[PDB]
Design a protein around this ligand. Sequence first.
Ligand SMILES: O=c1cc[nH]c(=O)[nH]1
Ligand SMILES: O=c1cc[nH]c(=O)[nH]1
Lengths: 284, 282
Amino acid sequence: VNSHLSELDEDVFHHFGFTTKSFDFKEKFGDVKFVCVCGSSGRIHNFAISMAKLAGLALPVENIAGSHARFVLYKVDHILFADHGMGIPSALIMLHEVTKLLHYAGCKDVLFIRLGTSGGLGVKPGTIVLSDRCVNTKLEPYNELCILGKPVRRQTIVDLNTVNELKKLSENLECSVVVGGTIAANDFYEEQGRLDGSICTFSKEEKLAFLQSAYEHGIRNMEMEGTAITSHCYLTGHRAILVCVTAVNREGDQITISTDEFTLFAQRPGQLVGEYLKRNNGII
Amino acid sequence: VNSHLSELDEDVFHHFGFTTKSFDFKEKFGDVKFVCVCGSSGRIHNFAISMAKLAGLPVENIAGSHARFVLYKVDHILFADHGMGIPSALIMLHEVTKLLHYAGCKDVLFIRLGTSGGLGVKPGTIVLSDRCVNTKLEPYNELCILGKPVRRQTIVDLNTVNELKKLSLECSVVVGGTIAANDFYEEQGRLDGSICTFSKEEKLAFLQSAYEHGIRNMEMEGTAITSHCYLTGHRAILVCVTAVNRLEGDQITISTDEFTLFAQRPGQLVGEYLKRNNGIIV
Ligand SMILES: O=c1cc[nH]c(=O)[nH]1
Ligand SMILES: O=c1cc[nH]c(=O)[nH]1
């Protein structure tokens, strides 16, 4: 743990717009055992409302975050909900402030579940990929950080037990569900091998060779936060999984599916997860 | 220009929620010469509102329904948000520069109106970036393209920076270097994250070393903006207010209202600049 936190009289959660004096953290958050997150405030809120319906809470699902917060925060029974924007650095802001919240509240062994969207590798659009490993662009199982100007690597650890549980649950439940490797990229375009960005320094042939070699090593999708979430949670004593839908066969680059078809796909991770939460005391 | 764009019948701006078939891009965006951006949709919306009122002209979102980003236009100025962090900024950068190209816009100025941590300056200070560097203090944006390391020089429109300093309020305006970090906490040398593997002395050493090399503030996007724009034939500057003196602490202790006040200061300077240099029609 970070003993420097003892130096504070009050901790300001800058991006959630509240402080440790805003509530009794033990009282308000102490019962939390799950944290559902995704890059969209709308989507994660939508998932929270669905979970409140499943659990029988009728009162609206309201934002806990303060006025000028960057992130939203919801609570349904023993489940916390938050967004985290796009990319590893945004996700780390969420991760730091949420895990401090959990610690202050005395929450232990919490499960973080990322309900994201991604680009697939050799799988049809609509496919849910349960990550068996989050890996960087060089296919290395680490989150890279540069702390105080010095390079740090942090091993990526997926909750394989929960992942296998999810796979088994999926076998008993409108799409394909695949366990495979997941690429985490700091770019939506060039580093993910897209030819249709504003800047491109490689040919199609060079793109494909990069993608197949990734595929051959078992990669099934590509997104932008995985290495951050599955490395951080483990390091802070919690568990994490990625359950991501794919929006394209990286056959091409463009996301050509309609907005509504996309909305449909992006809810598929929530569908599987909601049942898993339902069967494992996420809700009363 | 990426020739691969010609292989597309339609180009989908996924994160803005429209496509090349949504508008006549030449007609709709052709007169744009400025793009003002920041991490907050609300702040940039309010800024666009302020500029429209200044120009004596409802500022409606051009971006689609399920979009991650907002997009507004007031006369010759585009406004958009970009979340937090280099990867999220790159998303905005790719899609907006592609939009500018489809519109036939050339040599456009990107202006990031941000918040940051100050090094050795008082909170509420405006820092005009004369360089954007990484956490290793290199004036480059690092990328990993097709699994291979690539470095891109960061170019700040220093001519515009000089003009802004001359133009310049209840605050100081400083020209200095700007660190872009891939984190708010550990990579910025904060002691108050959920994880911290260093001491106060190692923190200060990191920041003093940065300060000695001219750095005056620290944020999370600068190297992305100032490398990408130069490579796509455009110009870029950062105008960021400071919210804390990082040599004195990490926590943002100023009130929400005061933070909001500070965060509007870059717009005060830049807004007057835009009025003077045909950003809006006067
Ligand atoms: O193809 C995709 C879709 C979502 N996010 C990504 O990083 N890539
Ligand atoms: O210290 C700060 C303040 C705002 N934004 C940052 O990235 N860092």
